[PDB]
Amino acid sequence: PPGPPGPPGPPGPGPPGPPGPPGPPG
Amino acid sequence: PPGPPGPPGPPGPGPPGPPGPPGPPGPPG
Amino acid sequence: PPGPPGPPGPPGPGPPGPPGPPGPPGPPG
């Protein structure tokens, strides 16, 4: 009979996060 | 005889990506 | 007898990372 399913695949990092908020007033 | 190979495993975990870049310069004065 | 285990699964890309830090502070002018 078919053997067991393979293990979990690779865990590539997710996408970079969005740009941060505007800097503090000058 | 040995049965057939099993199916492909589940999609991998995968951690959060890196932090975003710094934001835009603040407002003038 | 059962066949061999399956191959590793497909890559599992994670979620978007944390927002970037605040940008630089505005100009004096």
CSV table of all heavy atoms in Angstrom, one decimal:
chain,number,residue,atom,x,y,z
A,1,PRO,N,0.8,-1.2,0.0
A,1,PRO,CA,0.0,0.0,0.0
A,1,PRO,C,0.9,1.2,0.0
A,1,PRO,O,2.0,1.2,0.4
A,1,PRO,CB,-0.8,-0.1,1.3
A,1,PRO,CG,0.1,-0.8,2.2
A,1,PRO,CD,0.8,-1.9,1.3
A,2,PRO,N,0.3,2.4,-0.5
A,2,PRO,CA,1.1,3.6,-0.5
A,2,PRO,C,1.7,3.9,0.8
A,2,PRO,O,1.0,3.7,1.9
A,2,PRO,CB,0.1,4.7,-0.9
A,2,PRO,CG,-0.8,3.9,-1.8
A,2,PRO,CD,-1.0,2.6,-1.1
A,3,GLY,N,2.9,4.4,0.9
A,3,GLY,CA,3.6,4.8,2.1
A,3,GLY,C,3.0,6.1,2.7
A,3,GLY,O,2.1,6.7,2.1
A,4,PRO,N,3.5,6.6,3.8
A,4,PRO,CA,3.0,7.8,4.5
A,4,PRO,C,3.3,9.1,3.7
A,4,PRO,O,4.3,9.1,2.9
A,4,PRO,CB,3.8,7.8,5.8
A,4,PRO,CG,4.2,6.4,6.0
A,4,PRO,CD,4.5,5.9,4.6
A,5,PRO,N,2.5,10.1,3.8
A,5,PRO,CA,2.7,11.4,3.1
A,5,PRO,C,4.1,11.9,3.5
A,5,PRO,O,4.6,11.6,4.5
A,5,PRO,CB,1.6,12.3,3.7
A,5,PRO,CG,0.5,11.3,4.1
A,5,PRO,CD,1.2,10.1,4.6
A,6,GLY,N,4.6,12.7,2.6
A,6,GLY,CA,5.9,13.3,2.9
A,6,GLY,C,5.8,14.3,4.0
A,6,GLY,O,4.7,14.6,4.4
A,7,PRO,N,6.9,14.8,4.6
A,7,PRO,CA,6.9,15.7,5.7
A,7,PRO,C,6.6,17.1,5.2
A,7,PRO,O,6.3,17.3,4.0
A,7,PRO,CB,8.3,15.6,6.3
A,7,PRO,CG,9.1,15.4,5.0
A,7,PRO,CD,8.3,14.3,4.3
A,8,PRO,N,6.5,18.1,6.1
A,8,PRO,CA,6.1,19.5,5.6
A,8,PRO,C,7.3,20.0,4.7
A,8,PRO,O,8.4,19.8,4.9
A,8,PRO,CB,6.0,20.3,6.9
A,8,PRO,CG,5.7,19.3,7.9
A,8,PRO,CD,6.5,18.1,7.6
A,9,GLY,N,6.9,20.8,3.7
A,9,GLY,CA,7.9,21.4,2.8
A,9,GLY,C,8.6,22.5,3.5
A,9,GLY,O,8.5,22.7,4.6
A,10,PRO,N,9.5,23.2,2.7
A,10,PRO,CA,10.3,24.3,3.2
A,10,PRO,C,9.5,25.5,3.7
A,10,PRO,O,8.4,25.7,3.2
A,10,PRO,CB,11.2,24.7,2.0
A,10,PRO,CG,11.3,23.4,1.3
A,10,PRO,CD,9.9,22.9,1.3
A,11,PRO,N,10.0,26.3,4.7
A,11,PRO,CA,9.4,27.4,5.3
A,11,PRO,C,10.0,28.7,4.8
A,11,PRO,O,10.8,29.4,5.6
A,11,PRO,CB,9.6,27.2,6.8
A,11,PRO,CG,11.1,26.8,6.7
A,11,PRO,CD,11.1,25.8,5.6
A,12,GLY,N,9.8,29.2,3.6
A,12,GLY,CA,10.4,30.4,3.1
A,12,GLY,C,9.8,31.6,3.8
A,12,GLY,O,8.6,31.7,4.0
A,13,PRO,N,10.7,32.6,4.1
A,13,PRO,CA,10.1,33.8,4.8
A,13,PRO,C,9.0,34.5,4.0
A,13,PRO,O,9.0,34.5,2.8
A,13,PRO,CB,11.4,34.7,5.0
A,13,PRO,CG,12.4,33.6,5.3
A,13,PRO,CD,12.1,32.6,4.3
A,14,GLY,N,8.1,35.2,4.7
A,14,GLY,CA,7.0,35.9,4.1
A,14,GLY,C,7.5,37.1,3.5
A,14,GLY,O,8.7,37.4,3.6
A,15,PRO,N,6.7,38.0,2.8
A,15,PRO,CA,7.0,39.2,2.2
A,15,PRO,C,7.4,40.3,3.2
A,15,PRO,O,7.0,40.3,4.3
A,15,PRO,CB,5.7,39.6,1.4
A,15,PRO,CG,5.1,38.3,1.2
A,15,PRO,CD,5.3,37.6,2.5
A,16,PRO,N,8.3,41.3,2.7
A,16,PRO,CA,8.7,42.4,3.6
A,16,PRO,C,7.4,43.1,4.1
A,16,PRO,O,6.4,43.1,3.4
A,16,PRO,CB,9.5,43.2,2.7
A,16,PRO,CG,10.2,42.3,1.9
A,16,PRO,CD,9.2,41.2,1.6
A,17,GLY,N,7.5,43.7,5.3
A,17,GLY,CA,6.3,44.4,5.7
A,17,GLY,C,6.3,45.8,5.0
A,17,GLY,O,7.2,46.2,4.4
A,18,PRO,N,5.1,46.5,5.1
A,18,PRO,CA,4.9,47.8,4.5
A,18,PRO,C,5.8,48.9,5.1
A,18,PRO,O,6.4,48.8,6.2
A,18,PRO,CB,3.4,48.1,4.7
A,18,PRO,CG,3.1,47.3,6.0
A,18,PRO,CD,3.9,46.0,5.8
A,19,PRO,N,5.9,50.1,4.4
A,19,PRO,CA,6.7,51.2,4.9
A,19,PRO,C,6.2,51.7,6.2
A,19,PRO,O,5.0,51.8,6.4
A,19,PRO,CB,6.6,52.2,3.8
A,19,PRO,CG,6.1,51.5,2.6
A,19,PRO,CD,5.2,50.4,3.2
A,20,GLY,N,7.1,52.1,7.1
A,20,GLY,CA,6.7,52.6,8.4
A,20,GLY,C,6.0,53.9,8.3
A,20,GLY,O,5.8,54.5,7.2
A,21,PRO,N,5.5,54.5,9.4
A,21,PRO,CA,4.8,55.7,9.4
A,21,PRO,C,5.7,56.9,9.3
A,21,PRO,O,6.9,56.8,9.4
A,21,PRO,CB,4.1,55.7,10.8
A,21,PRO,CG,5.0,55.1,11.6
A,21,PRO,CD,5.5,53.9,10.8
A,22,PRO,N,5.1,58.1,9.0
A,22,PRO,CA,5.9,59.3,8.8
A,22,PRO,C,6.7,59.6,10.1
A,22,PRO,O,6.3,59.2,11.2
A,22,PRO,CB,4.8,60.4,8.6
A,22,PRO,CG,3.8,59.6,7.8
A,22,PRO,CD,3.7,58.3,8.6
A,23,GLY,N,7.9,60.2,9.9
A,23,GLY,CA,8.7,60.5,11.1
A,23,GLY,C,8.1,61.6,11.9
A,23,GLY,O,7.2,62.3,11.5
A,24,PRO,N,8.7,61.9,13.1
A,24,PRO,CA,8.1,62.9,14.0
A,24,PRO,C,8.4,64.3,13.4
A,24,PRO,O,9.4,64.5,12.8
A,24,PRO,CB,8.9,62.6,15.3
A,24,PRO,CG,10.2,62.1,14.9
A,24,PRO,CD,9.8,61.1,13.8
A,25,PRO,N,7.5,65.3,13.7
A,25,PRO,CA,7.7,66.6,13.2
A,25,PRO,C,9.1,67.2,13.4
A,25,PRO,O,9.8,66.8,14.3
A,25,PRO,CB,6.6,67.4,14.0
A,25,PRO,CG,5.5,66.4,14.1
A,25,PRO,CD,6.3,65.1,14.4
A,26,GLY,N,9.4,68.2,12.6
A,26,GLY,CA,10.7,68.9,12.7
A,26,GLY,C,10.6,70.2,13.3
A,26,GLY,O,9.5,70.8,13.4
B,1,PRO,N,6.1,-7.1,-2.4
B,1,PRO,CA,6.8,-5.9,-2.9
B,1,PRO,C,6.4,-4.7,-2.2
B,1,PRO,O,5.3,-4.5,-1.7
B,1,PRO,CB,6.4,-5.8,-4.4
B,1,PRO,CG,5.0,-6.5,-4.4
B,1,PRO,CD,5.1,-7.7,-3.4
B,2,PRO,N,7.3,-3.7,-2.2
B,2,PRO,CA,7.0,-2.4,-1.5
B,2,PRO,C,5.9,-1.6,-2.3
B,2,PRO,O,6.0,-1.5,-3.5
B,2,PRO,CB,8.3,-1.7,-1.5
B,2,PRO,CG,9.3,-2.8,-1.5
B,2,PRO,CD,8.7,-3.8,-2.5
B,3,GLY,N,4.9,-1.1,-1.5
B,3,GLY,CA,3.9,-0.3,-2.2
B,3,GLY,C,4.5,0.9,-2.8
B,3,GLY,O,5.7,1.1,-2.8
B,4,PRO,N,3.7,1.8,-3.4
B,4,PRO,CA,4.2,3.0,-4.0
B,4,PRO,C,4.6,4.1,-3.0
B,4,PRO,O,4.2,4.0,-1.9
B,4,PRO,CB,3.1,3.4,-4.9
B,4,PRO,CG,2.1,2.2,-5.0
B,4,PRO,CD,2.3,1.6,-3.6
B,5,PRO,N,5.4,5.1,-3.5
B,5,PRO,CA,5.8,6.2,-2.6
B,5,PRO,C,4.5,6.9,-2.2
B,5,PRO,O,3.5,6.9,-2.9
B,5,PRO,CB,6.7,7.1,-3.4
B,5,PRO,CG,7.3,6.1,-4.4
B,5,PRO,CD,6.1,5.2,-4.7
B,6,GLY,N,4.5,7.5,-1.0
B,6,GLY,CA,3.3,8.2,-0.6
B,6,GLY,C,3.3,9.6,-1.2
B,6,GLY,O,4.2,10.0,-1.9
B,7,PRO,N,2.1,10.3,-1.1
B,7,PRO,CA,2.0,11.7,-1.7
B,7,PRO,C,2.9,12.7,-1.0
B,7,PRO,O,3.4,12.5,0.1
B,7,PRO,CB,0.5,12.0,-1.5
B,7,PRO,CG,0.2,11.3,-0.3
B,7,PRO,CD,0.9,9.9,-0.4
B,8,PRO,N,3.0,13.9,-1.7
B,8,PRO,CA,3.8,15.0,-1.2
B,8,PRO,C,3.3,15.5,0.1
B,8,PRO,O,2.1,15.6,0.3
B,8,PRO,CB,3.7,16.1,-2.3
B,8,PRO,CG,3.4,15.2,-3.6
B,8,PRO,CD,2.5,14.2,-3.0
B,9,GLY,N,4.1,15.9,1.0
B,9,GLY,CA,3.7,16.4,2.3
B,9,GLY,C,3.0,17.7,2.2
B,9,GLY,O,2.7,18.2,1.1
B,10,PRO,N,2.6,18.3,3.4
B,10,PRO,CA,1.9,19.6,3.4
B,10,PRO,C,2.8,20.8,3.2
B,10,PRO,O,4.0,20.7,3.3
B,10,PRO,CB,1.2,19.6,4.8
B,10,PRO,CG,2.2,18.9,5.6
B,10,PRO,CD,2.6,17.7,4.7
B,11,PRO,N,2.2,21.9,2.7
B,11,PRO,CA,3.0,23.1,2.5
B,11,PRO,C,3.7,23.4,3.8
B,11,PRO,O,3.2,23.2,4.9
B,11,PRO,CB,1.9,24.2,2.2
B,11,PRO,CG,0.9,23.4,1.4
B,11,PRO,CD,0.8,22.1,2.3
B,12,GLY,N,5.0,23.9,3.6
B,12,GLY,CA,5.8,24.2,4.8
B,12,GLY,C,5.3,25.3,5.7
B,12,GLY,O,4.4,26.1,5.3
B,13,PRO,N,5.9,25.4,6.9
B,13,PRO,CA,5.4,26.5,7.8
B,13,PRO,C,5.7,27.8,7.1
B,13,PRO,O,4.8,28.3,6.4
B,13,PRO,CB,6.3,26.2,9.0
B,13,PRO,CG,7.5,25.5,8.5
B,13,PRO,CD,6.9,24.6,7.5
B,14,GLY,N,6.8,28.4,7.3
B,14,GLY,CA,7.1,29.7,6.7
B,14,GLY,C,6.9,30.8,7.7
B,14,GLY,O,5.7,31.2,8.0
B,15,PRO,N,7.9,31.5,8.2
B,15,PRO,CA,7.8,32.6,9.2
B,15,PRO,C,7.5,33.9,8.5
B,15,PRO,O,7.5,34.0,7.3
B,15,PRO,CB,9.2,32.6,9.9
B,15,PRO,CG,10.0,31.4,9.3
B,15,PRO,CD,9.3,31.2,7.9
B,16,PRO,N,7.2,34.9,9.4
B,16,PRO,CA,6.9,36.3,8.9
B,16,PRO,C,8.1,36.8,8.1
B,16,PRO,O,9.2,36.4,8.4
B,16,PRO,CB,6.6,37.1,10.1
B,16,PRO,CG,6.1,36.0,11.1
B,16,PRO,CD,7.0,34.9,10.8
B,17,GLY,N,7.9,37.7,7.2
B,17,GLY,CA,9.0,38.3,6.4
B,17,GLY,C,9.7,39.3,7.3
B,17,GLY,O,9.3,39.5,8.4
B,18,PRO,N,10.8,40.0,6.8
B,18,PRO,CA,11.4,41.0,7.6
B,18,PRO,C,10.6,42.3,7.7
B,18,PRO,O,9.7,42.5,7.0
B,18,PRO,CB,12.7,41.2,6.8
B,18,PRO,CG,12.3,41.0,5.4
B,18,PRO,CD,11.4,39.8,5.5
B,19,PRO,N,10.9,43.1,8.7
B,19,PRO,CA,10.2,44.4,9.0
B,19,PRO,C,10.3,45.3,7.7
B,19,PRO,O,11.2,45.2,6.9
B,19,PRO,CB,11.0,45.0,10.1
B,19,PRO,CG,11.5,43.8,10.9
B,19,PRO,CD,12.0,42.9,9.7
B,20,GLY,N,9.3,46.2,7.6
B,20,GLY,CA,9.2,47.1,6.5
B,20,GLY,C,10.3,48.1,6.6
B,20,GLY,O,11.0,48.2,7.6
B,21,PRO,N,10.5,49.0,5.6
B,21,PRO,CA,11.5,50.0,5.6
B,21,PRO,C,11.1,51.2,6.5
B,21,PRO,O,9.9,51.3,6.8
B,21,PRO,CB,11.7,50.4,4.2
B,21,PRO,CG,10.2,50.3,3.7
B,21,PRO,CD,9.8,49.0,4.3
B,22,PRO,N,12.0,52.1,6.8
B,22,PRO,CA,11.6,53.2,7.6
B,22,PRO,C,10.6,54.1,6.8
B,22,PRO,O,10.6,54.0,5.6
B,22,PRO,CB,12.9,54.0,7.8
B,22,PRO,CG,13.9,52.8,7.9
B,22,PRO,CD,13.5,51.9,6.8
B,23,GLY,N,9.7,54.8,7.5
B,23,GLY,CA,8.7,55.6,6.8
B,23,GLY,C,9.3,56.9,6.2
B,23,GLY,O,10.5,57.1,6.2
B,24,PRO,N,8.4,57.7,5.6
B,24,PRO,CA,8.9,59.0,5.0
B,24,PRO,C,9.3,60.0,6.1
B,24,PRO,O,8.9,59.9,7.2
B,24,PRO,CB,7.6,59.5,4.2
B,24,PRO,CG,6.8,58.2,4.1
B,24,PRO,CD,7.0,57.5,5.4
B,25,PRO,N,10.1,61.0,5.7
B,25,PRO,CA,10.5,62.0,6.6
B,25,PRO,C,9.3,62.7,7.2
B,25,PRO,O,8.2,62.8,6.6
B,25,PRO,CB,11.3,63.0,5.7
B,25,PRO,CG,11.9,62.1,4.7
B,25,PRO,CD,10.8,61.1,4.4
B,26,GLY,N,9.4,63.2,8.4
B,26,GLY,CA,8.3,63.8,9.1
B,26,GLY,C,8.0,65.2,8.4
B,26,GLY,O,8.7,65.6,7.5
B,27,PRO,N,6.9,65.8,8.9
B,27,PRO,CA,6.5,67.1,8.3
B,27,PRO,C,7.5,68.2,8.7
B,27,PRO,O,8.2,68.1,9.7
B,27,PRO,CB,5.1,67.4,8.9
B,27,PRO,CG,4.6,66.0,9.1
B,27,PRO,CD,5.8,65.3,9.7
B,28,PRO,N,7.5,69.3,8.0
B,28,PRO,CA,8.4,70.5,8.3
B,28,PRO,C,8.0,71.1,9.6
B,28,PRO,O,7.5,70.5,10.5
B,28,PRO,CB,8.2,71.4,7.1
B,28,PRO,CG,7.7,70.5,6.0
B,28,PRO,CD,6.8,69.5,6.7
B,29,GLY,N,8.4,72.4,9.7
B,29,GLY,CA,8.1,73.2,10.9
B,29,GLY,C,7.2,74.4,10.7
B,29,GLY,O,6.1,74.4,11.2
C,1,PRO,N,4.0,-4.8,2.3
C,1,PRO,CA,4.7,-3.8,3.0
C,1,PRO,C,4.5,-2.4,2.4
C,1,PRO,O,4.5,-2.3,1.2
C,1,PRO,CB,6.2,-4.1,3.1
C,1,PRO,CG,6.3,-4.9,1.8
C,1,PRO,CD,5.0,-5.7,1.6
C,2,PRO,N,4.2,-1.4,3.2
C,2,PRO,CA,3.9,0.0,2.7
C,2,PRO,C,5.1,0.5,1.9
C,2,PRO,O,6.3,0.1,2.1
C,2,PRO,CB,3.7,0.8,3.9
C,2,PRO,CG,3.2,-0.2,4.9
C,2,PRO,CD,4.1,-1.4,4.7
C,3,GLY,N,4.9,1.5,1.0
C,3,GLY,CA,6.0,2.1,0.2
C,3,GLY,C,6.7,3.1,1.0
C,3,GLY,O,6.2,3.4,2.1
C,4,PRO,N,7.7,3.7,0.5
C,4,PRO,CA,8.5,4.8,1.3
C,4,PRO,C,7.7,6.1,1.5
C,4,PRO,O,6.6,6.3,0.9
C,4,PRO,CB,9.7,5.1,0.4
C,4,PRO,CG,9.8,3.7,-0.4
C,4,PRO,CD,8.4,3.4,-0.7
C,5,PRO,N,8.1,6.9,2.5
C,5,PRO,CA,7.4,8.1,2.8
C,5,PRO,C,7.4,9.0,1.5
C,5,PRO,O,8.3,8.9,0.7
C,5,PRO,CB,8.2,8.8,3.9
C,5,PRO,CG,8.7,7.6,4.6
C,5,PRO,CD,9.1,6.7,3.5
C,6,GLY,N,6.5,10.0,1.4
C,6,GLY,CA,6.4,10.9,0.3
C,6,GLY,C,7.5,11.9,0.3
C,6,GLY,O,8.3,12.0,1.3
C,7,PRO,N,7.7,12.7,-0.7
C,7,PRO,CA,8.7,13.7,-0.7
C,7,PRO,C,8.3,14.9,0.1
C,7,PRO,O,7.1,15.0,0.5
C,7,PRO,CB,8.8,14.1,-2.2
C,7,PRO,CG,7.4,14.1,-2.6
C,7,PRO,CD,6.8,12.8,-1.9
C,8,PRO,N,9.2,15.8,0.5
C,8,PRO,CA,8.8,17.0,1.3
C,8,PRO,C,7.8,17.8,0.5
C,8,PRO,O,7.7,17.7,-0.7
C,8,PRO,CB,10.1,17.7,1.4
C,8,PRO,CG,11.1,16.7,1.5
C,8,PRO,CD,10.7,15.7,0.4
C,9,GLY,N,7.0,18.6,1.2
C,9,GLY,CA,5.9,19.3,0.6
C,9,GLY,C,6.4,20.6,-0.1
C,9,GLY,O,7.6,20.9,-0.1
C,10,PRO,N,5.5,21.4,-0.7
C,10,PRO,CA,5.9,22.6,-1.4
C,10,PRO,C,6.2,23.7,-0.4
C,10,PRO,O,5.8,23.7,0.8
C,10,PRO,CB,4.6,23.0,-2.1
C,10,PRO,CG,3.9,21.7,-2.4
C,10,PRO,CD,4.1,21.0,-1.0
C,11,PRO,N,7.1,24.7,-0.8
C,11,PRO,CA,7.5,25.7,0.2
C,11,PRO,C,6.2,26.4,0.7
C,11,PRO,O,5.2,26.5,0.0
C,11,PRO,CB,8.3,26.7,-0.7
C,11,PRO,CG,9.0,25.8,-1.7
C,11,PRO,CD,7.9,24.8,-2.0
C,12,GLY,N,6.3,26.9,1.9
C,12,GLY,CA,5.1,27.5,2.5
C,12,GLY,C,5.5,29.0,2.9
C,12,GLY,O,5.7,29.3,4.0
C,13,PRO,N,5.5,29.9,1.9
C,13,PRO,CA,5.8,31.3,2.2
C,13,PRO,C,5.0,31.8,3.4
C,13,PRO,O,3.7,31.7,3.4
C,13,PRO,CB,5.6,32.0,0.9
C,13,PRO,CG,4.5,31.2,0.2
C,13,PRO,CD,4.9,29.8,0.5
C,14,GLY,N,5.6,32.5,4.3
C,14,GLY,CA,4.9,33.1,5.4
C,14,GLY,C,4.2,34.4,5.1
C,14,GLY,O,4.0,34.7,4.0
C,15,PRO,N,3.7,35.0,6.2
C,15,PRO,CA,2.9,36.3,6.0
C,15,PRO,C,3.8,37.5,5.9
C,15,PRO,O,5.0,37.4,6.2
C,15,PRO,CB,2.0,36.3,7.2
C,15,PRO,CG,3.0,35.8,8.3
C,15,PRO,CD,3.6,34.6,7.6
C,16,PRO,N,3.3,38.6,5.5
C,16,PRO,CA,4.1,39.9,5.5
C,16,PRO,C,4.6,40.2,6.9
C,16,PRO,O,3.9,39.9,7.9
C,16,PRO,CB,3.1,40.9,5.0
C,16,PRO,CG,2.1,40.1,4.2
C,16,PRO,CD,1.9,38.9,5.1
C,17,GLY,N,5.9,40.7,6.9
C,17,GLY,CA,6.5,41.0,8.2
C,17,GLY,C,5.9,42.3,8.8
C,17,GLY,O,4.9,42.9,8.3
C,18,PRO,N,6.4,42.8,10.0
C,18,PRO,CA,5.9,44.0,10.7
C,18,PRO,C,6.2,45.3,9.9
C,18,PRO,O,7.2,45.4,9.2
C,18,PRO,CB,6.8,43.9,11.9
C,18,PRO,CG,7.1,42.5,12.1
C,18,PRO,CD,7.4,42.1,10.7
C,19,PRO,N,5.3,46.3,10.1
C,19,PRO,CA,5.5,47.6,9.4
C,19,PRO,C,6.9,48.1,9.7
C,19,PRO,O,7.4,47.7,10.8
C,19,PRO,CB,4.4,48.4,10.0
C,19,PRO,CG,3.3,47.4,10.3
C,19,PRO,CD,4.1,46.2,10.9
C,20,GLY,N,7.4,48.9,8.8
C,20,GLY,CA,8.7,49.5,9.1
C,20,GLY,C,8.7,50.5,10.3
C,20,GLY,O,7.6,50.9,10.6
C,21,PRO,N,9.8,50.9,10.8
C,21,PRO,CA,9.8,51.9,11.9
C,21,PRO,C,9.4,53.2,11.4
C,21,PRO,O,9.2,53.4,10.2
C,21,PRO,CB,11.3,51.9,12.3
C,21,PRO,CG,11.8,50.5,12.0
C,21,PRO,CD,11.1,50.3,10.6
C,22,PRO,N,9.2,54.2,12.3
C,22,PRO,CA,8.8,55.6,11.8
C,22,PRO,C,10.0,56.1,11.0
C,22,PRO,O,11.2,55.8,11.2
C,22,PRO,CB,8.7,56.4,13.1
C,22,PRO,CG,8.3,55.3,14.2
C,22,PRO,CD,9.1,54.1,13.8
C,23,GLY,N,9.7,57.0,10.0
C,23,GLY,CA,10.7,57.6,9.2
C,23,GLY,C,11.5,58.6,9.9
C,23,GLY,O,11.2,58.9,11.1
C,24,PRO,N,12.4,59.3,9.3
C,24,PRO,CA,13.2,60.4,9.9
C,24,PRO,C,12.3,61.6,10.3
C,24,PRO,O,11.3,61.8,9.6
C,24,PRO,CB,14.3,60.7,8.9
C,24,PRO,CG,14.4,59.4,8.1
C,24,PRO,CD,13.0,59.0,8.0
C,25,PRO,N,12.7,62.4,11.3
C,25,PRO,CA,12.0,63.6,11.6
C,25,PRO,C,12.1,64.7,10.6
C,25,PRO,O,13.2,65.0,10.2
C,25,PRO,CB,12.5,63.9,13.0
C,25,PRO,CG,13.9,63.4,13.0
C,25,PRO,CD,13.8,62.1,12.2
C,26,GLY,N,11.1,65.4,10.3
C,26,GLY,CA,11.1,66.5,9.4
C,26,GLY,C,12.2,67.5,9.5
C,26,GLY,O,13.0,67.5,10.4
C,27,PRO,N,12.3,68.4,8.5
C,27,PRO,CA,13.4,69.5,8.5
C,27,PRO,C,13.0,70.6,9.4
C,27,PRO,O,11.8,70.9,9.7
C,27,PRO,CB,13.4,69.9,7.0
C,27,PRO,CG,11.9,69.8,6.7
C,27,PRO,CD,11.5,68.5,7.3
C,28,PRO,N,14.0,71.4,9.9
C,28,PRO,CA,13.8,72.5,10.8
C,28,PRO,C,12.9,73.6,10.1
C,28,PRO,O,12.1,74.2,10.7
C,28,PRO,CB,15.2,73.0,11.2
C,28,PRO,CG,16.0,71.7,11.0
C,28,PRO,CD,15.4,71.1,9.8
C,29,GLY,N,13.2,73.8,8.9
C,29,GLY,CA,12.5,74.7,8.1
C,29,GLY,C,11.1,74.2,7.7
C,29,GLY,O,10.9,73.7,6.6
